Amino acid sequence: SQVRQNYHQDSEAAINRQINLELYASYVYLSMSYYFDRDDVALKNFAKYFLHQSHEEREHAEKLMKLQNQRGGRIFLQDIKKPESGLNAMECALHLEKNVNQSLLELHKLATDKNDPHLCDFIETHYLNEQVKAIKELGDHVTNLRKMGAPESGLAEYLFDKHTLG
Amino acid sequence: TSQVRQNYHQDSEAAINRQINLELYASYVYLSMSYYFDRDDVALKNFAKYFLHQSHEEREHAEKLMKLQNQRGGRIFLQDIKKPESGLNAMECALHLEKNVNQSLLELHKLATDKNDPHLCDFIETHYLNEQVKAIKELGDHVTNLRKMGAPESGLAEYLFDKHTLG
Amino acid sequence: TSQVRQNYHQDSEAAINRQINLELYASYVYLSMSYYFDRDDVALKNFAKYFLHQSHEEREHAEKLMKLQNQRGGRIFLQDIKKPESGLNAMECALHLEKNVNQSLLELHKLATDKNDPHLCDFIETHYLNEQVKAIKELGDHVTNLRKMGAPESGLAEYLFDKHTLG
Amino acid sequence: SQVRQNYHQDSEAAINRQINLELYASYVYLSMSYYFDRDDVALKNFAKYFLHQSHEEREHAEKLMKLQNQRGGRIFLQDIKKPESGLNAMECALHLEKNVNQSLLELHKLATDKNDPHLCDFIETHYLNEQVKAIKELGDHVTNLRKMGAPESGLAEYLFDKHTLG
Amino acid sequence: TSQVRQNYHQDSEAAINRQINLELYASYVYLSMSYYFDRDDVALKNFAKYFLHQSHEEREHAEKLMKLQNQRGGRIFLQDIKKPESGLNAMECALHLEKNVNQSLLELHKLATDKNDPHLCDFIETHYLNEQVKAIKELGDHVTNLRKMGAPESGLAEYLFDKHTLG
Ligand SMILES: [Fe+3]
Ligand SMILES: [Fe+3]
Ligand SMILES: [Fe+3]
Ligand SMILES: [Fe+3]
Ligand SMILES: [Fe+3]
Ligand SMILES: [Fe+3]
Ligand SMILES: [Fe+3]
Ligand SMILES: [Fe+3]
Ligand SMILES: [Fe+3]
Ligand SMILES: [Fe+3]
């Protein structure tokens, strides 16, 4: 690639793996979103919240595909793997976002070891603080749903859906 | 016979008249439910407004079928409109009402299909079938939330639903 | 018995439920008349719009009585709504319909007077009695004009009236 | 009085008694309003609701004083007599409004017996339907507070204060 | 054969080419009618404007079918457009014209149904079948009013209709 400079093959491969994971996270959120749209669940603000999360993750993948091309790497796509209560879904989302953050931190370590400061600052600027805020927000939600009495209390999940996500 | 009548089978004409009576009946059921929740000893005013809007919507459904009857050169035949406890119970009654209306409309579409009346088929599809699907899904959502909130045993649940979903 | 009920006689409560049924019947009659003039073999579209507006007014008359029933602590009891030639003849049928409703309202007011229910008396006076007088005078004006123009023998007359008075 | 016409002495005296009762009702509502402003009760929308009721009743008395002068009667004022939970207060207000309505209906009967149609229509137009709506509204409130679990449930009274009176 | 063609039968392609010619014929008929009423010895200008607008609408019906032909990968085949007394008689000829176009469209839909072409079925339903129903009902309303007013013997009737209905 006529533009490639200081871009290690390990970083390129890791970006491609991270692209797959962000798309996977988007798929997970899409599944959760339409679960809460079911007539026997019917927490429509849970559904909207997860649908917005799904769209954010897809944007996270497209930005990495953009970065791959900017640095002269080559995008390699793989299959996107297929993905009970409002509290349980927030706990799965929290654990999902921590797995994505962990992957991003290992990516940043790789970029650091290969002395790629542009990639390091790109990850810091567009991904690391977003994950921290996403994880903190999901922790806030898990805490409130538990203190209110979820998942045994359906009233708690209804009122949270109205007052926090609505 | 009508100067405008074309490809309009007498069985369709009759079935449209029965569907008009059923839509008017549904409007009557919703009107009763609306003023039940306006009672001073029930007093769930957003349930009442919700059901009153459903009543007006069913009356519009009946009037559009009367319009269609005239458009196709059929003749309207009207019959008596038959006379029609908690917020959850009423939502369940409405859900069953909408599925009974839906079933009739699907039987109407099957008759129109069998008589090769594509205009009536698409008319029913465009103005009624998806309206019923959305109404049934919405009523299913309401029933689920009221159950999950603790209705009918919890009057608090029905109160908060009236405020946060129907209000 | 209601916590809000005060000075509201059982006879008045039953008479209001009967009046609700009559108002819904009148609405049904006007609805029937409206779509008759929408037929392709009658096709007097402003007659149709006029009677449809009357149909909706009668339904508001019934809902306001249902509201009053709840306000006073009575209990709504609904019954079957019974099923209902020229523009002149429809105006004449409407005139008699409104006079029969007026007569029922006047007997209702006499009942409220005899029960010393001044709130019900003023409710009937404010929302119904003058509305009936204006409807009856208007319908008499329409009948008179159609007759003088040469209806029902003159189809031209009914066409021009639809355009110049109801249009 | 140069303006007095068809205005019985019994009607004039009854209007003066009704003036006293409307002022009494205003005093009752003022007491209830500042009870819910107490720091150990603190239902501020209950307090605002009753304060508005207090101001309406005073207006009811001033309109009757106006009517007294319009018909050539003479206003005679008397002492205004001094007047636990949100539900109990609504029940006291409901019973208060029914006592005022009863007094107004006896007033109308008096006006009817004395063949005073102006007074009859004045009472019908400005007082009878207002009482019916006031009594119906208070009945709605009592019903909702009970179905929600008042007075044992303080949560019920808090949420009603926010969602109905707020 | 076309790179875009999918599930588009040869008989459907030919039938659409026949329908195109018929819509163009109908437009020519309305065009003839419009300028007849513009004649100095007929001189019903709103009849003339009404029929000219019908002529333009039929032309658009033909162009949308030509667009559909290209969309589905068919090939347009054009043929000669064949050459086409009172206001009432012209409305009656128009009514009969629209019923013949509707009949042709209904046979078109039966063919599309037989070929399992749901895109074509819904295209016909959405853009043609309900337009035909509305056009036929409107023309029947016009014929009925003209007859009731005393047309065609009454020249006064056709003038007033031209002013109050078409104007
Ligand atoms: Fe992400
Ligand atoms: Fe940095
Ligand atoms: Fe319906
Ligand atoms: Fe709330
Ligand atoms: Fe009425
Ligand atoms: Fe004129
Ligand atoms: Fe007062
Ligand atoms: Fe009066
Ligand atoms: Fe056409
Ligand atoms: Fe369709």
Side-chain angles (χ1 to χ4, degrees), chain A residues 1-43 45-58 60-83 85-108 110-166, chain B residues 1-9 11-59 61-78 80-109 111-167, chain C residues 1-9 11-44 46-48 50-59 61-78 80-84 86-130 132-152 154-167, chain D residues 1-43 45-58 60-83 85-108 110-166, chain E residues 1-48 50-56 58-63 65-84 86-109 111-147 149-152 154-167:
Chain A
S1 183
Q2 77 200 140
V3 313
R4 199 182 177 129
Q5 181 176 26
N6 197 40
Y7 195 54
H8 198 267
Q9 51 183 3
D10 291 348
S11 299
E12 165 179 25
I15 288 293
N16 282 337
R17 294 189 315 269
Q18 188 70 33
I19 287 165
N20 187 263
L21 185 63
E22 303 284 352
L23 292 170
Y24 174 74
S26 178
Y27 207 12
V28 173
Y29 276 122
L30 176 64
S31 181
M32 286 180 176
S33 174
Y34 283 80
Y35 175 83
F36 289 88
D37 180 64
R38 289 171 46 163
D39 75 89
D40 59 358
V41 180
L43 294 165
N45 292 317
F46 272 88
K48 288 175 185 166
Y49 177 85
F50 290 139
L51 188 59
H52 176 74
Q53 294 299 294
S54 177
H55 293 160
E56 201 164 73
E57 293 301 330
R58 158 84 185 249
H60 291 174
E62 293 189 26
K63 181 176 292 181
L64 284 165
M65 295 170 73
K66 191 72 175 187
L67 169 80
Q68 187 76 283
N69 282 345
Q70 279 187 294
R71 295 294 303 274
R74 288 303 172 252
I75 298 168
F76 185 82
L77 300 171
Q78 303 165 46
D79 298 353
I80 306 172
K81 294 294 166 190
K82 84 163 255 114
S85 72
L87 170 60
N88 177 255
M90 290 290 196
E91 292 176 331
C92 286
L94 175 62
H95 291 92
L96 169 66
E97 298 278 4
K98 293 181 94 179
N99 284 344
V100 172
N101 198 28
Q102 187 66 32
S103 180
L104 286 165
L105 292 172
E106 293 172 1
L107 180 60
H108 185 284
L110 175 65
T112 295
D113 293 346
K114 301 308 179 185
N115 303 298
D116 191 337
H118 172 262
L119 180 54
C120 287
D121 188 72
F122 183 87
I123 299 166
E124 293 158 21
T125 303
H126 297 280
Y127 293 75
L128 292 192
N129 189 242
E130 287 300 314
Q131 288 310 117
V132 163
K133 285 171 298 100
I135 290 171
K136 175 60 167 58
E137 168 179 298
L138 287 167
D140 294 347
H141 293 346
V142 165
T143 288
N144 277 286
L145 284 160
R146 290 180 184 153
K147 305 230 268 202
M148 296 165 71
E152 37 281 305
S153 172
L155 179 61
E157 303 209 329
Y158 171 94
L159 292 176
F160 183 85
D161 170 280
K162 300 301 171 304
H163 288 98
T164 294
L165 304 183
Chain B
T1 173
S2 175
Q3 70 188 326
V4 316
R5 202 180 177 125
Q6 192 168 21
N7 200 35
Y8 195 54
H9 198 282
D11 299 352
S12 308
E13 177 187 13
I16 287 286
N17 284 328
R18 290 183 316 265
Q19 189 69 33
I20 289 164
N21 186 261
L22 180 61
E23 302 284 350
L24 292 167
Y25 174 75
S27 176
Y28 208 10
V29 174
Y30 276 124
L31 173 64
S32 178
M33 285 182 176
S34 175
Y35 283 86
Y36 174 84
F37 289 93
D38 182 66
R39 289 170 48 163
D40 76 291
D41 59 357
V42 180
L44 295 168
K45 256 111 192 69
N46 291 315
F47 273 87
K49 286 180 278 196
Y50 177 83
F51 289 140
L52 186 58
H53 181 265
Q54 295 299 88
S55 176
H56 292 160
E57 156 165 316
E58 293 302 333
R59 163 84 190 248
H61 293 175
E63 292 189 24
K64 182 181 295 177
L65 286 168
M66 296 172 73
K67 191 73 174 188
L68 170 78
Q69 188 77 284
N70 284 346
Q71 280 185 294
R72 296 297 302 275
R75 290 305 171 253
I76 296 169
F77 180 80
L78 300 167
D80 297 352
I81 308 171
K82 292 291 152 57
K83 66 119 81 214
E85 220 181 274
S86 72
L88 173 62
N89 181 324
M91 288 290 191
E92 292 175 329
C93 274
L95 175 60
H96 281 295
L97 172 70
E98 299 277 0
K99 291 182 94 179
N100 284 345
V101 172
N102 199 31
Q103 187 71 36
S104 179
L105 285 162
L106 292 170
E107 296 291 345
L108 182 55
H109 186 282
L111 174 65
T113 299
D114 293 345
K115 302 308 176 188
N116 302 300
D117 192 336
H119 171 265
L120 180 53
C121 288
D122 189 72
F123 184 88
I124 298 300
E125 292 156 19
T126 304
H127 298 280
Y128 293 75
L129 294 190
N130 190 67
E131 283 311 295
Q132 288 309 115
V133 163
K134 286 166 44 234
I136 289 171
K137 175 60 166 59
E138 167 177 298
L139 287 167
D141 291 350
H142 293 345
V143 167
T144 289
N145 278 286
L146 284 160
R147 290 182 185 145
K148 287 204 157 163
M149 297 167 71
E153 292 92 22
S154 173
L156 177 61
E158 303 209 326
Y159 171 92
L160 294 177
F161 182 85
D162 174 282
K163 299 301 172 303
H164 289 99
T165 293
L166 303 183
Chain C
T1 179
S2 191
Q3 74 199 323
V4 306
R5 211 199 175 113
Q6 167 171 36
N7 201 38
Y8 192 63
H9 198 290
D11 294 351
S12 306
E13 173 183 15
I16 291 287
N17 285 330
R18 289 193 310 275
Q19 188 70 34
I20 289 164
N21 186 262
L22 178 61
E23 303 286 353
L24 291 169
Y25 174 75
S27 178
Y28 205 12
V29 171
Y30 276 125
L31 173 65
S32 180
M33 286 180 177
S34 174
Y35 284 73
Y36 177 83
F37 289 93
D38 181 64
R39 288 171 47 162
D40 74 292
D41 60 356
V42 179
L44 292 169
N46 290 314
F47 275 86
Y50 178 84
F51 287 137
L52 186 57
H53 181 76
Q54 291 298 293
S55 179
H56 292 160
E57 267 207 333
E58 295 305 333
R59 156 80 179 251
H61 290 175
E63 292 190 24
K64 183 178 310 190
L65 282 166
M66 296 174 74
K67 191 71 175 186
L68 170 80
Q69 189 78 285
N70 282 343
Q71 281 186 296
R72 296 297 302 273
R75 289 305 172 253
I76 297 171
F77 180 78
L78 299 172
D80 297 353
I81 306 171
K82 294 298 163 193
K83 102 184 213 78
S86 70
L88 170 62
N89 291 326
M91 289 290 195
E92 290 173 328
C93 276
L95 176 61
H96 295 95
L97 169 68
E98 301 277 3
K99 291 182 94 178
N100 285 342
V101 174
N102 198 28
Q103 188 66 33
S104 182
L105 285 163
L106 292 172
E107 295 170 2
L108 180 58
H109 186 283
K110 182 63 172 175
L111 174 64
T113 296
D114 289 344
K115 300 306 179 185
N116 299 296
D117 191 337
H119 172 262
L120 178 52
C121 288
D122 188 72
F123 185 87
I124 299 302
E125 294 157 22
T126 305
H127 298 277
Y128 294 75
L129 294 185
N130 190 66
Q132 287 308 119
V133 163
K134 287 166 2 187
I136 290 170
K137 175 62 169 59
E138 165 177 299
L139 286 168
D141 292 351
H142 292 345
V143 168
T144 290
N145 277 284
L146 284 159
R147 288 200 181 118
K148 298 212 299 170
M149 297 167 70
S154 173
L156 176 62
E158 303 207 327
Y159 172 90
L160 293 180
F161 184 85
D162 173 278
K163 298 301 170 304
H164 287 277
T165 294
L166 306 182
Chain D
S1 183
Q2 77 200 140
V3 313
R4 199 182 177 129
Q5 181 176 26
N6 197 40
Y7 195 54
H8 198 267
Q9 51 183 3
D10 291 348
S11 299
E12 165 179 25
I15 288 293
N16 282 337
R17 294 189 315 269
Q18 188 70 33
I19 287 165
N20 187 263
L21 185 63
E22 303 284 352
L23 292 170
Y24 174 74
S26 178
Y27 207 12
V28 173
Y29 276 122
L30 176 64
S31 181
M32 286 180 176
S33 174
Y34 283 80
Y35 175 83
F36 289 88
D37 180 64
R38 289 171 46 163
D39 75 89
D40 59 358
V41 180
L43 294 165
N45 292 317
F46 272 88
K48 288 175 185 166
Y49 177 85
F50 290 139
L51 188 59
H52 176 74
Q53 294 299 294
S54 177
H55 293 160
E56 201 164 73
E57 293 301 330
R58 158 84 185 249
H60 291 174
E62 293 189 26
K63 181 176 292 181
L64 284 165
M65 295 170 73
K66 191 72 175 187
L67 169 80
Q68 187 76 283
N69 282 345
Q70 279 187 294
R71 295 294 303 274
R74 288 303 172 252
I75 298 168
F76 185 82
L77 300 171
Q78 303 165 46
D79 298 353
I80 306 172
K81 294 294 166 190
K82 84 163 255 114
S85 72
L87 170 60
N88 177 255
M90 290 290 196
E91 292 176 331
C92 286
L94 175 62
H95 291 92
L96 169 66
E97 298 278 4
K98 293 181 94 179
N99 284 344
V100 172
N101 198 28
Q102 187 66 32
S103 180
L104 286 165
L105 292 172
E106 293 172 1
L107 180 60
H108 185 284
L110 175 65
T112 295
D113 293 346
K114 301 308 179 185
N115 303 298
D116 191 337
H118 172 262
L119 180 54
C120 287
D121 188 72
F122 183 87
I123 299 166
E124 293 158 21
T125 303
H126 297 280
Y127 293 75
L128 292 192
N129 189 242
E130 287 300 314
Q131 288 310 117
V132 163
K133 285 171 298 100
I135 290 171
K136 175 60 167 58
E137 168 179 298
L138 287 167
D140 294 347
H141 293 346
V142 165
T143 288
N144 277 286
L145 284 160
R146 290 180 184 153
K147 305 230 268 202
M148 296 165 71
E152 37 281 305
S153 172
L155 179 61
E157 303 209 329
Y158 171 94
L159 292 176
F160 183 85
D161 170 280
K162 300 301 171 304
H163 288 98
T164 294
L165 304 183
Chain E
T1 178
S2 179
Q3 78 196 322
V4 314
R5 202 183 178 130
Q6 181 172 21
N7 196 40
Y8 193 61
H9 202 281
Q10 225 167 30
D11 300 334
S12 303
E13 174 183 15
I16 288 287
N17 281 329
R18 289 194 313 271
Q19 189 69 33
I20 288 165
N21 186 263
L22 176 59
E23 303 285 351
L24 291 168
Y25 173 75
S27 177
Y28 206 11
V29 172
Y30 277 121
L31 174 66
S32 179
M33 288 185 178
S34 175
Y35 283 75
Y36 174 84
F37 288 91
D38 178 65
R39 288 171 46 163
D40 79 274
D41 61 357
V42 180
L44 293 168
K45 273 45 221 297
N46 293 315
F47 273 87
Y50 176 83
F51 288 136
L52 185 57
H53 179 74
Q54 293 298 293
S55 180
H56 290 159
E58 294 302 332
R59 171 179 70 181
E60 289 311 300
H61 291 174
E63 291 192 24
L65 286 165
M66 296 172 74
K67 190 70 176 186
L68 169 78
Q69 189 75 283
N70 280 343
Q71 283 186 297
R72 296 297 302 276
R75 289 304 172 252
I76 297 169
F77 182 79
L78 298 171
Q79 296 148 254
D80 297 352
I81 306 171
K82 287 294 164 8
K83 95 185 229 77
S86 73
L88 170 61
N89 290 129
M91 287 292 173
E92 290 174 328
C93 171
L95 174 59
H96 296 90
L97 172 71
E98 300 278 5
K99 291 182 93 177
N100 284 344
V101 174
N102 198 28
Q103 188 68 33
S104 180
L105 286 162
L106 293 173
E107 297 293 341
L108 226 207
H109 188 283
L111 177 65
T113 297
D114 173 57
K115 302 307 178 186
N116 300 296
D117 192 338
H119 173 266
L120 178 52
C121 288
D122 189 69
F123 183 88
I124 298 301
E125 294 156 21
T126 303
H127 298 280
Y128 294 72
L129 293 188
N130 190 67
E131 304 290 321
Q132 287 308 115
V133 162
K134 286 164 25 198
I136 290 170
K137 176 61 167 59
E138 169 178 301
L139 288 170
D141 292 349
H142 292 347
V143 167
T144 290
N145 276 286
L146 284 159
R147 290 202 179 109
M149 298 168 72
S154 173
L156 179 62
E158 304 208 329
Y159 169 94
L160 292 179
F161 182 84
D162 171 281
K163 299 301 171 165
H164 288 98
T165 292
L166 305 184

